[model samples]
Target: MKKATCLTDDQRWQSVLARDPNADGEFVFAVRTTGIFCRPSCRARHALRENVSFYANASEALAAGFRPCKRCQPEKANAQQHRLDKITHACRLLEQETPVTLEALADQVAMSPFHLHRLFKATTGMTPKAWQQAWRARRLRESLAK
Candidate 1:
């Protein structure tokens, strides 16, 4: 997931204009003319700045009668949150120094191994083994620093 942003409306508008990926999950931009709300990195044609409004989350946008952008599927926060929880659990398991297998983790998360690897890499920018290695290296550094 992209880091969330909490900034002024003007700055968020700038993010919308620039199609900034980092602005996604921070706030959604709703087009008054189209009655659609989209992620900041949506590829849809840009709407006029004057016709744009911001919402802190997708539910707020839906409550205001704005439909989710087809390209971004802004209403999938719950699904994403579910995946995040699974990833978090996997990470904790890795840190415990217990031998963890991809298939095992996938079973725990109820996802196929391929899908789990793809989702984990997409969300964290690293394979599970790589993340585990990095975490171990960081721990070693901390131990040496003490």
Candidate 2:
């Protein structure tokens, strides 16, 4: 089911016209004519204000028959969030004093290693190896500090 609007419908439409970052994450706007929804900060061509409708989130937009904007990647926000959760679970497994390989981490999270690596890097701005190295360094610092 579509969710209720998070912002005043008029206010959200204004944010879309202005391409406001302040409205990013607050809601997504779907263009009825194009059948696409985008983040408020999307640089895609503007649509008529009359054809736009605001959704509380991507799922709501999808529920209302709007596809994710290819240029803006509105749906990726939810996908990235879910990937982050999986990445977090993998990090916890790493912290459990057991050696975790990239393949193993991906298996645990039910994702392919390549996809997990891409999502993990996209979300954290670092590869899993980099994150593991940093985590090791943090642990080392804590041990020496004690």
Candidate 3:
């Protein structure tokens, strides 16, 4: 899912900033002062930068004596689900006449434009611009028929 590459801590840090569900199980982060760990998409309040560090999994954090969080329950639910939401929002917002720029859409969705572009294709089997064109085409065809 991460494109056959291992993510650096800084990359993981970026995901945490976005609360990206797609990064789940790619790693968990342990906050040193709290002695706790959570998924990259953890909805709990953001921890301080230097206070956090990477662990390959929640198990690794446990080995280091960092407890799992009750708030995120990092031990559970890493594989799928709300990876659906933000990308789908891109579709919902795609409803209007104006074309939403890749930068702005991804910015609002809290992902890099590249990642957003990639996932849009992955989940929907079409590029975003393709979707936009299809939407306009569908509108014309349907309206003509009506």
Candidate 4:
């Protein structure tokens, strides 16, 4: 059997256009034509704009697609273990030092970026980006409490 690509911008766009619940959090799609990006499950209408492009990840989306949707940032890594370890470390390092790419973190742990990504999903419950967001939120909360 052929293997399925984890998710593609086209797949995400199709899901968005169709409002596919099954595609939620599976991947994100960005419309290059409009410079707007959305979650795989975004309920927005299909943009008729031309020059659309797809991204495998959010950084790619930012490179082509506009800012992330307020609802979905693609970095969410909830309950997965690899995600928990990698993202938690990333968050800690970001707190202690400047933020680095996931690749850097993966390298520190002696794993390929792909393996780190997969483990992120396996360890954390959400995406790497989501964990980053949570870390950011926690930082904000900490500051607010001070």
Top TM-score model:
3
Candidate 1 on 49-105: residue-level lDDT in tens? 677777777667779898877565443433444667777677667665556676877
TM-score of each: 0.42, 0.40, 0.45, 0.34
Ranking by TM-score: 3, 1, 2, 4
> Stretches of candidate 2 above 4 Å error?
1-6, 73-146
Kindly list the per-residue Cα lDDT of model 3 for residues 1-146, writing each as its tens digit: 43221357677666666666555465677888787877545756646877776777777778889887645534456444566676787777777766667688767767787788777777888876676688778988998754
Q: Per-residue lDDT of 1-146 in model 4, one digit per residue for the tens?
A: 32222565555456556764455344455675567766545566545545554555555567663877645434453334354666567546645333568677777777787776776566665765676688778998999754
Q: Which pairs in model 1 have colliding backbones? A: none
Q: Which ten residues in a row have the lowest lDDT in candidate 2?
A: 72-81
Q: Lowest-scoring 10 consecutive residues by lDDT in candidate 4?
A: 72-81
Better of 2 and 3 by lDDT: 3
Q: Give per-residue lDDT, candidate 2, residue 51.
A: 72
| CA deviation > 4 Å runs, candidate 3 | 1-6, 70-146
Clashes of each: 0, 0, 0, 19
lDDT of each: 0.68, 0.66, 0.68, 0.58
Give the alpha carbon lDDT tens digit for every residue of 1-146 in model 2.
Answer: 54345457676556566664444465676888888877545657746657776777877788888887644534335333466787676656676544567777767667687887787677777865676688778998889854
